[PDB]
């Protein structure tokens, strides 16, 4: 009687605190470790929410509760399909693991020498500003590592889950020997 | 017997789906509406997680479970105090409501004419790039609305929850009559 209550509450207390943690610190801009915990919680949350609605539809309070449970069941299923479609289509255009981050669907692809570095774009703009400070690149407010201003890519790819856009370098200014600025516009 | 199970499960099914929604779409870069739902969920999650641990400490499985519950109770309380301290200190330096967003603790303050517009900074850098395109301002990859390039602030404030930084305009270039670029560095 009381023992079953205690095991029930203890397990749920752990889960609710875990949801609070991933809801407060589960962001790649805060802690990459907590972000992966949130993603594992969200991956488990889709079928659990669906399966919980399947239960409330098999054992409902009334007919309206049975229908609502089925609507919520499809809702959990539709959100997972939607997430998988966007993340897959983004991953095929980028190959980066930021494609699976629901928080960001705009990705900036910049080729630095051999490989291409992908970073999430917060604001989808028609223009992106490149700033090389003494040999260190900063694209659209976020750093991209070391790169020579002369070896700046003439084209930069932005990847949304439904379209891949290319940005050609319109303007190019050099502040120093390796310091400079450049702009990119779509077409 | 079975009826209590049905009402209990139906309520939790709604809650778990709501957590899934706010965990998947609760971001200001996706939907401002879903973001506020997440914040209401998180504000309710702190005392609920604490109160649930208080229960498992009053009615524990064993002595170790009683101690763990008390540790989680203080953990839920410490995270809320931490969030409130950062958000308040940020709100006093900025006055913006983005200070209460746990996802962002770096805020960019740019004075556009009469008032000052604040936007969250993803990457805390020592430099911030200003780009005015035909009379539209873009600071660090995100737009700030209409502004004249001539009317660009000589100083821009960055506000972290523990320090307020000022950025003086080092370089200034004009691409056109109202189009131009500028950079800001801290001190
Ligand atoms: C930037 C650093 C700021 C300070 C960091 C503080 C670190 C957090 O401190 C928390 C320690 O406080 C102890 C809280 O006490 C826990 C209460 O537990 C009750 C035990 O119940 C068991 C009963 O059998
Ligand atoms: C930024 C760091 C700020 C640190 C602040 C930490 C504050 C933590 O508060 C600790 C208080 O929480 C302890 C909760 O324990 C109470 C449980 O009560 C159990 C009593 O059992 C009665 C038995 O009948």
Author numbering:
A (entry chain B), B (entry chain A): 13 to 199
Please, what does the article write about this entry?
After extensive crystallization trials and refinement, batCOV5-M crystallized in lipidic cubic phase (LCP) and the crystals diffracted to ∼3 Å resolution. The final batCOV5-M model was determined to 3.21 Å (batCOV5-Mxtal) and contained residues 13–199 of batCOV5-M, and the amino-terminus (12 residues) and the carboxy-terminus (21 residues) were not modeled due to weak electron densities. The batCOV5-Mxtal structure is organized as a homodimer, with each protomer containing a short amino-terminus, a three-helix transmembrane domain (TMD) and a cytosolic CTD consisting of an eight-stranded β-sandwich. The overall shape of the batCOV5-Mxtal dimer looks like a pair of pincers, with TMD as the “handle” and CTD as the “head” of the pincers. The two protomers form extensive TMD–TMD and CTD–CTD contacts with a buried area of ∼3,100 Å2 at the dimer interface, which accounts for ∼25% of the solvent-accessible surface area of each protomer, suggesting that the batCOV5-Mxtal dimer is a stable form. In the batCOV5-Mxtal structure, TM1 is placed almost in the sample plane as TM2/TM3, and the three helices of TMD resemble a capital letter “N,” while in SARS2-MAF the TMD helices form a more compact three-helix bundle. As a result, using TM2/TM3 as anchors, TM1 swings ∼40 degrees away from TM2 and CTD undergoes a rigid-body rotation of ∼30 degrees away from TMD during a transition from the “short” SARS2-MEM to the “long” batCOV5-Mxtal. Structural alignment yielded an all-Cα RMSD of 1.8 Å between batCOV5-Mxtal and SARS2-M-FabEM-long and an all-Cα RMSD of 1.6 Å between SARS2-MEM and SARS2-M-FabEM-short, while the major deviation came from flexible loops of these proteins. This result indicates that the structural organization is highly conserved in betacoronavirus M proteins, and the batCOV5-Mxtal structure represents the long conformation of M protein. In the second pattern, the N3C helix binds to a groove formed along the CTD dimer interface nearly vertical to the membrane plane.
